[PDB]
């Protein structure tokens with residue numbers, strides 16, 4: 338199968354590229370390298386089944402060229418930084434809504450049969466039902482990022498129905514592991530490398546969120562994709578997260594422990610009731626019953642995934 | 653209170669303007685007259701409480717000008733309802749996502765405290781539960797128009813939470829009445845005026861939809877708005893439709909009757925199972941229990957609304 342991975346030079350994208358290349362897919366990566374790096378995929382350069390295109394998906398000609406002769410698109414290009422929402426909403430809109438719109442216009446009449454989209458738990462906002470099922474509603478995102486992800490899902494559904502392709506929408510929890518350059522673990526490790534004596538923690542440390550290691554995440558994406566390929570649904574919605582959750586404070590403790598440091602935790606007290614920033618969801622735990630029906634399950638719980646990520650990042 | 657009505661020269665917007673002006677609001681209209689008309693609101697020019705701005709919401713400067721010194725925005729500007737099947741994805745994206753995005757960016761730098769948005773039943777797609785409640789999910793719109801409306805809702809919710817204003821999202825069923833130049837009744841009347849002997853009906857005539865007369869619709873918008881003003885919800889979702897529904901064939905019969913005509917009905921059979929066009933939902937009936945708890949209820953059922961609309965249009 339011929340596949341396009343947008344954002345394939347990024348964190349999740351490069352691990353996905355690795356898996357697809359190792360299973361004999363013909364893989365084209367489209368990435369503007371605004372956050373990704375060729376280093377994440379450099380072992381594949383020159384491989385006859387691999388092609389890399391450096392291009393900004395704001396440019397419709399580049400997107401139309403990248404979808405040509407492709408059977409499936411894994412659309413992982415985005416700016417995933419929730420924190421920047423109250424300073425740079427334009428960036429989040431452009432890199433989540435606008436470029437997905439461009440992709441969808443390119444996909445129309447292109448012979449692409451499948452579109453896999455990495456959405457986010459943030460589409461649920463402060464979800465009132467926990468663990469949160471895929472049919473939870475009203476969907477009320479509280480960040481510009483979660484709103485942009487939800488808007489992208491909507492456009493995908495409408496285009497899939499109108500121009501006859503199939504869409505797999507995967508709402509990810511927090512994904513951590515090697516090659517990650519955003520999120521709380523990354524922030525904590527680099528802060529403690531700069532100053533081992535103190536740790537600036539945004540918010541009050543009580544935010545509880547489900548974490549998945551990249552290995553379980555890629556396994557789950559492939560399991561869902563293969564199940565989807567064999568199914569009949571035009572648009573399919575799946576949560577992908579862990580069975581449990583962990584607090585920001587516990588993450589700081591694990592990071593400190595693995596670095597053999599004992600810093601003073603400096604909690605900023607946050608906003609809107611201890612959130613780290615405007616739009617930061619306080620409680621997140623996705624139901625994964627639907628994903629588990631495919632046979633997938635995480636091998637590591639949230640605490641193990643955090644500890645493994647820290648160890649990997651310090652080596 | 654000072655309010656801005658985008659699309660205020662259109663069908664619903666001009667009736668809303670009438671009501672707000674009669675209740676002593678200071679009203680500003682923003683409309684590019686792409687589908688609306690000066691005739692719908694010209695009677696208010698010269699009133700010291702009324703201002704008209706002819707401007708395209710693709711223009712960020714005019715939107716920024718229009719939100720100045722405004723307390724509430726009623727955002728009714730959108731793609732026209734006339735033949736939505738034949739409208740291109742680019743037009744739908746620009747007139748639903750793009751101009752809403754421009755509005756939200758203007759609002760974050762203003763004194764706007766409330767944003768009311770007329771969304772559409774089409775965000776529900778082919779809902780499996782009928783009457784369809786506000787918490788129906790997964791939302792899987794089947795047209796680019798329904799997807800674009802859902803994208804606008806998402807952006808509104810995220811901006812509301814991030815930039816501290818309150819949003820009232822009202823999902824409208826089919827709205828009919830005087831000044832409407834869209835939809836099946838208007839098309840049927842003009843077709844029978846051109847040729848009284850035959851009526852070409854798109855689709856199979858069995859599409860069943862909830863119709864609300866404009867008078868009930870404005871009553872409901874105001875009831876929900878006043879209730880929302882007295883509440884604390886940051887973002888609130890309401891359906892606004894009728895208790896019942898009616899088929900295209902029945903509407904054609906009513907139109908013929910009120911015109912004293914007896915034409916031959918020629919059903920084209922449509923597409924995708926008798927739909928009038930690609931992406932036309934076959935069955936639509938919104939649950940209005942939530943709205944009815946505010947004390948609102950439709951005075952006219954779908955049949956009465958159709959009959960009154962026909963009489964008004966023939967005047």
Ligand SMILES: NC(=O)c1ccc[n+]([C@@H]2O[C@H](COP(=O)([O-])OP(=O)(O)OC[C@H]3O[C@@H](n4cnc5c(N)ncnc54)[C@H](O)[C@@H]3O)[C@@H](O)[C@H]2O)c1
Nearest residue numbers: 344346347348349369370371372373394414415455509512
């Ligand atoms: N990492 C997480 O915890 C997480 C959680 C939920 C969802 N997601 C989603 O998963 C996907 C991957 O995220 P990630 O964490 O690997 O982020 P990342 O930033 O590492 O990867 C995203 C890639 O997109 C590329 N990109 C950005 N804008 C682009 C543009 N205009 N044109 C082309 N390429 C562009 C970047 O260069 C980057 O390589 C995204 O859709 C993200 O929203 C991630």
Ligand SMILES: NC(=O)c1ccc[n+]([C@@H]2O[C@H](COP(=O)([O-])OP(=O)(O)OC[C@H]3O[C@@H](n4cnc5c(N)ncnc54)[C@H](O)[C@@H]3O)[C@@H](O)[C@H]2O)c1
Nearest residue numbers: 659662663664683684686687688708709729730770824827
């Ligand atoms: N009429 C219905 O049955 C129905 C059903 C569901 C939702 N709605 C929604 O209700 C709202 C009003 O619909 P309506 O039936 O009154 O439609 P309408 O076309 O009569 O009113 C929309 C108005 O917006 C204006 N407009 C469009 N694009 C603009 C732009 N870029 N800048 C400025 N003005 C612009 C048009 O000139 C028009 O006056 C819309 O949001 C529509 O999607 C209507």
